[PDB]
Design an enzyme around this catalytic site. Structure first.
Site, PDB file in Angstrom:
ATOM      1  CB  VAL A  27       0.861  18.780   0.803  1.00 43.40           C
ATOM      2  CG1 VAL A  27       1.014  20.268   1.071  1.00 43.40           C
ATOM      3  CG2 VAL A  27       0.843  18.018   2.096  1.00 43.40           C
ATOM      4  N   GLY A  28      -1.170  16.233  -0.634  1.00 40.87           N
ATOM      5  CA  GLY A  28      -1.196  14.996  -1.414  1.00 40.87           C
ATOM      6  C   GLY A  28      -1.502  13.717  -0.643  1.00 40.87           C
ATOM      7  N   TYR A  30      -2.032   4.969   2.928  1.00 36.02           N
ATOM      8  CA  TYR A  30      -1.449   5.225   4.250  1.00 36.02           C
ATOM      9  C   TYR A  30      -2.161   6.377   4.990  1.00 36.02           C
ATOM     10  N   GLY A  31      -2.525   7.421   4.244  1.00 37.07           N
ATOM     11  CA  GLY A  31      -3.294   8.555   4.764  1.00 37.07           C
ATOM     12  C   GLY A  31      -3.001   9.787   3.931  1.00 37.07           C
ATOM     13  CB  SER A  32      -4.647  12.596   2.719  1.00 37.26           C
ATOM     14  OG  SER A  32      -5.609  13.171   3.574  1.00 37.26           O
ATOM     15  CB  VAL A  33       0.191  15.060   4.303  1.00 41.90           C
ATOM     16  CG1 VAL A  33       0.933  16.195   4.962  1.00 41.90           C
ATOM     17  CG2 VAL A  33       0.737  13.726   4.798  1.00 41.90           C
ATOM     18  CG  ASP A 163       9.596   5.600   6.659  1.00 41.02           C
ATOM     19  OD1 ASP A 163      10.567   6.082   7.283  1.00 41.02           O
ATOM     20  OD2 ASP A 163       9.511   4.398   6.313  1.00 41.02           O
TER      21      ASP A 163
HETATM   22  O1  0ON Z   1       4.665  13.498   5.274  1.00 37.81           O
HETATM   23  C1  0ON Z   1       5.000  14.545   5.841  1.00 37.81           C
HETATM   24  N1  0ON Z   1       5.017  14.714   7.168  1.00 37.81           N
HETATM   25  C2  0ON Z   1       4.630  13.776   8.034  1.00 37.81           C
HETATM   26  C3  0ON Z   1       5.288  12.542   8.113  1.00 37.81           C
HETATM   27  C4  0ON Z   1       4.865  11.587   9.023  1.00 37.81           C
HETATM   28  C5  0ON Z   1       3.798  11.874   9.863  1.00 37.81           C
HETATM   29  C6  0ON Z   1       3.152  13.102   9.788  1.00 37.81           C
HETATM   30  C7  0ON Z   1       3.555  14.061   8.871  1.00 37.81           C
HETATM   31  C8  0ON Z   1       5.437  15.803   5.043  1.00 37.81           C
HETATM   32  C9  0ON Z   1       4.815  16.112   3.826  1.00 37.81           C
HETATM   33  C10 0ON Z   1       5.227  17.256   3.143  1.00 37.81           C
HETATM   34  C11 0ON Z   1       6.241  18.044   3.710  1.00 37.81           C
HETATM   35  N2  0ON Z   1       6.807  17.732   4.876  1.00 37.81           N
HETATM   36  C12 0ON Z   1       6.435  16.651   5.550  1.00 37.81           C
END
Ligand code: 0ON
Ligand code: IRG
Length: 335
Positions: A27-28, A30-33, A163
């Protein structure tokens, strides 16, 4: 017994996650999600893999901080931890940290960067931010970086604080580099956010920190005697004393046609003097949230131990502390 991890490569990075988490989809960044399907809960989730979590003292402590904060947050309007895992079987091989939360639909940047909102909508979204903020602040946590891109909202308008320019939403005491700012720096941000939702424009789009203050003072007016007497830095005092004295604007002229109750709340949020700024708890009881405020369902947090913030430790100690927190994680209730 450890779950079965499966390995895969997602764009730039390797991912090794329990089998429970399926259909990883970036989804995009610090790290990637990644978005994922969680088979155990049936939920869509966000899985974040921290990049280089233990590469320096600063990273390692930041990693520890993020895990500690997320493990603590248990409130409807604040992001919470669904899971945390590592593929490592021991501390010695402990190198990767993944965090799991609810997948949120969109950030507040999207909702506003496409359409203006109704007053009823801003009411409900500001209400929810304040409710999460009451909770966060009650733990002696200050967010410090509240901006539309840090506020997640799904299709039902339910909002959570997370955050993941900053200067546009930043309280002027921070701009001026004050060391001793309080929790109401977040209230200032909420004010800038609400203004933006009501008008569809960034309230204070500074090009830099000086421009930023100039734009701020132009609405709020240059500090009076009462506030100037509280400024301990001389160059700061003499900067604002050296500008042309700006008068306070009437907010009703600035936010013309907006609900006057919204104008009033803004007046109470966008106060230069941080000692006089409305708090989250107070704002919740403001007339503007008449249709949502329930004093028995705006909970405060358990005490949060942040004594670690003042500690200076080795990378491997932050790592061991982070591992303990991974190990002791208790998943939240399914129902
Ligand atoms: O950054 C997100 N979630 C998240 C936030 C902190 C730690 C692990 C996952 C996120 C991204 C897109 C939609 N919802 C949550
Ligand atoms: N009770 C307070 C309230 C507001 C304050 C503020 N706000 C800036 C005018 C916007 N700035 C400062 C400060 C002190 C030293 C160096 C830089 C800034 N202190 C404040 C103390």
């Amino acid at each position: 017994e450890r779950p079965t991890f499966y390995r895969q490569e997602l764009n730039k990075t390797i991912w090794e996650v329990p089998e429970r988490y399926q259909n990883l989809s970036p989804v995009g960044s610090y790290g990637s999600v990644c978005a994922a399907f969680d088979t155990k809960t049936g939920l869509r989730v966000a899985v974040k893999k921290l990049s280089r979590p233990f590469q320096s003292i600063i990273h390692a402590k930041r990693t520890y901080r993020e895990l500690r904060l997320l493990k603590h947050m248990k409130h409807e309007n604040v992001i919470g931890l669904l899971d945390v895992f590592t593929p490592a079987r021991s501390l010695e091989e402990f190198n990767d940290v993944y965090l799991v939360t609810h997948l949120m639909g969109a950030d507040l940047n999207n909702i506003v960067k496409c359409q203006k909102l109704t007053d009823d909508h801003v009411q409900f979204l500001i209400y929810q931010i304040l409710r999460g903020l009451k909770y966060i602040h009650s733990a002696d946590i200050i967010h410090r970086d509240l901006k539309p891109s840090n506020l997640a909202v799904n299709e039902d308008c339910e909002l959570k604080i997370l955050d993941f320019a900053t200067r546009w939403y930043r309280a002027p005491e921070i701009m001026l580099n004050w060391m001793h700012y309080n929790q109401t720096v977040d209230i200032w941000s909420v004010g800038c956010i609400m203004a933006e939702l009501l008008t569809g424009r960034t309230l204070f789009p500074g090009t830099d920190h000086i421009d930023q203050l100039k734009l701020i003072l132009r609405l709020v007016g240059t500090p009076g005697a009462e506030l100037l007497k509280k400024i301990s830095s001389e160059s700061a005092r003499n900067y604002i004393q050296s500008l042309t004295q700006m008068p306070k604007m009437n907010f009703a002229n600035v936010f013309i046609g907006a609900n006057p109750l919204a104008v009033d709340l803004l007046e109470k949020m966008l106060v230069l003097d941080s000692d006089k700024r409305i708090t989250a708890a107070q704002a919740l009881a403001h007339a503007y949230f008449a249709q949502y405020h329930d004093p028995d369902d705006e909970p405060v947090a358990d005490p949060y131990d942040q004594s670690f913030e003042s500690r200076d430790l080795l990378i491997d100690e932050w790592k061991s502390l982070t591992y303990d927190e991974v190990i002791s994680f208790v998943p939240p209730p399914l129902d």
